[PDB]
């Protein structure tokens, strides 16, 4: 998969749209139950004064405090409804019994719930076995004896994972995200990936990049009873694979040169990644939804604003009647440089001076009063105002698709629609009603 990213900068709306990114949208979750076999050990009647026995004593006290804290949290979006439903189903009496029966001899098993859902199961940690077989026997009677420092060190190391799990759940109040390493190890995550009910393409894609999956997954709390701590991990699946996806970097373009004192501007409301889903283009407004890795983007349809297929008409012709666009219309003149994948827009405006830069050639270009565009070839740093923005070092088929600014068509007598964030047709309605205001004002004056 060669990284053939082709960005095309536009001078019409001064929005640069990348291309060549093969995305992978997520349409659902896969809830699996992960159980830690806790042990409810009563306060031992040990009166030893040795350092090792004492250390085992505060470690057991820490374990008991962690268990009590877990019970304390157990007392009280689609991001968590599947896990919540699984927890509620597992709260039914007998489901824990079936889970333990299935996992009696195997660390992995498939259990069918009462309502019909079949969930994969794991046994990441075995604290009950280790405790009842090592700590309880020797440290049982009135005489206390622990002669192995290896034993206490091993107990510290193993109980550490439970301690971090309790800490993360306490701070995050029962639901954690992203899936930390402590909750599910990389090897265990890979093993669960291999057992997923999907084809080999999705399995290979989700195996290649595992940190992305960790970022997009979740973790819940269900129940601590019958000496079992079960937390459901909501790993995702990707129904659509390698769909053509494109970023839509935008930048505020302000008036022709700079009219001294005040004037308009029109940046493009919609930014972030776009993707094609079953003939309808998906849209992601938030930056934290879609994550980039190499030449392929990973997204999340949790709050994706599904759009029709005519979205691509916005880029090539903003004033197309086949599709409806949108542009935030403001009045603030700030020089900015939206860094893109294979370039950098620069809206040098007003008094501030902006110049391209190179480490070896020094300053090689000087901007003007317009949203100009600078390629990544021959440029490594862009200096705008008082700050310096690094220009990506990636190589791609850059295309300066120039045109004319859309500002010139707007009426120069007045520039209405201050601080507006609606569709372009609505902005046409706004300019229409503002010039209706002005025509009725002047006709009333003439009638007077």
């Amino acid at each position, epitope marked *: 998969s060669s990284q053939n990213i082709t960005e095309e900068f536009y001078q019409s709306t001064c929005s640069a749209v990348s291309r060549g990114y093969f995305g992978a949208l997520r349409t659902g979750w896969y809830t699996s139950v992960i159980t830690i076999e806790l042990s409810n050990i*009563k306060e031992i009647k040990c009166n030893g004064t040795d350092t090792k026995v004492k250390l085992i004593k505060q470690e057991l006290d820490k374990y008991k405090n962690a268990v009590t804290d877990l019970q304390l949290l157990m007392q009280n979006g689609s991001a968590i409804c599947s896990g919540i439903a699984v927890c509620k189903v597992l709260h039914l009496e*007998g489901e824990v019994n*079936k889970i333990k029966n*299935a996992l*009696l001899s195997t660390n992995k098993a498939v259990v*069918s719930l*009462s309502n019909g859902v079949s969930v994969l199961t794991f046994k990441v940690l075995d604290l009950k076995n280790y405790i009842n077989n090592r700590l309880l026997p020797i440290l049982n009677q009135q005489s206390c004896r622990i002669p192995n420092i290896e034993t206490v060190i091993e107990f510290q190391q193993m109980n550490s994972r439970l301690l971090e799990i309790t800490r993360e759940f306490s701070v995050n109040a029962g639901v954690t995200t992203p899936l930390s390493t402590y909750m599910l190890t990389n090897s265990e995550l890979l093993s669960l990936i291999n057992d997923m009910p999907i084809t080999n393409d999705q399995k290979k894609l989700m195996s290649s990049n595992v940190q992305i999956v960790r970022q997009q997954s979740y973790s819940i709390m269900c129940i601590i*009873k*019958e000496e079992v701590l079960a937390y459901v991990v909501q790993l995702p699946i990707y129904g659509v694979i390698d769909t053509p996806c494109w970023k839509l970097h935008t930048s505020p373009l302000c008036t022709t040169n700079i009219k001294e004192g005040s004037n308009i501007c029109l940046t493009r409301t919609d930014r972030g990644w776009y993707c094609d889903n079953a003939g309808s283009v998906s849209f992601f407004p938030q930056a934290d939804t879609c994550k980039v890795q190499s030449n392929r983007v990973f997204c999340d349809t949790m709050n994706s604003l599904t759009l029709p297929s005519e979205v691509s008409l916005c880029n090539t012709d903003i004033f197309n009647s086949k599709y409806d666009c949108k542009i935030m219309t403001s009045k603030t003149d700030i020089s900015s440089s939206v860094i893109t994948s294979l370039g950098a827009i620069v809206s040098c405006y007003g008094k501030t001076k902006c110049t391209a830069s190179n480490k070896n050639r020094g300053i090689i270009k000087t901007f003007s009063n317009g949203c100009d565009y600078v390629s990544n070839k021959g440029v490594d740093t862009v200096s705008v105002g008082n700050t310096l923005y690094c220009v990506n070092k990636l190589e791609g088929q850059n295309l300066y698709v120039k045109g004319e600014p859309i500002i010139n068509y707007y009426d120069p007598l007045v520039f209405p629609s201050d601080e507006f964030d609606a569709s372009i047709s609505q902005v046409n309605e706004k300019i229409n009603q503002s010039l209706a205001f002005i025509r009725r004002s002047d006709e009333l004056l003439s009638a007077i």
Partner: antibody
Amino acid sequence: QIQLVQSGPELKKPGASVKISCKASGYTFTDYSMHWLKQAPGKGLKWMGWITTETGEPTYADDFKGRFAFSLDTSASTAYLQISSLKAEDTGVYFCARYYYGPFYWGQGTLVTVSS
Amino acid sequence: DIQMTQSPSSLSASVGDRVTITCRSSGNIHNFLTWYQQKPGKSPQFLVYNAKTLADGVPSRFSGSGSGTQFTLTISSLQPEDFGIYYCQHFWTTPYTFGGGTKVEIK
């Protein structure tokens, strides 16, 4: 090493109340729930229902609704069944059970006899 | 409710017989079946955790197999210390139903 101990046998008359108690020792009583079973004389084994040893909300099988009720005292680690409005069909044995790695685990039986 | 019945209601075998007991279910249960060994005038105990996992402390002669609706035990060799009434009971969901009782005897 988990031992469940029940009460003793009784011989009484219809219309009165029977108190049969099971005490659980060997584990913390909060988590594991208490389950009650019926044995008819010579027939198979019925299933009453369950009483949760954490909150105290029981659920009853449709056959055994109306006359039977279990209550528990978590402080004493004992759960007892009160059987009011005794019928002649009450003859049989009573069992207290819990979920131990799959199937149930029942303690010793308590013969109940109904005279006239 | 899932009703469970046993075909050999009354069984009588010799000391060296390989006896077989089957249980049926009205519905489909993924394993979730166990048996009990009722001694006369005592409290029965389990011997097979699931359809194919024998319990600890049970002689290896006992063992089981089957999934879905048909389930069946396997006894390698009868031993006179083993005698009583055998029942089978699922734990798929409440309510909980037992069988008719396999009253094994000695020929």
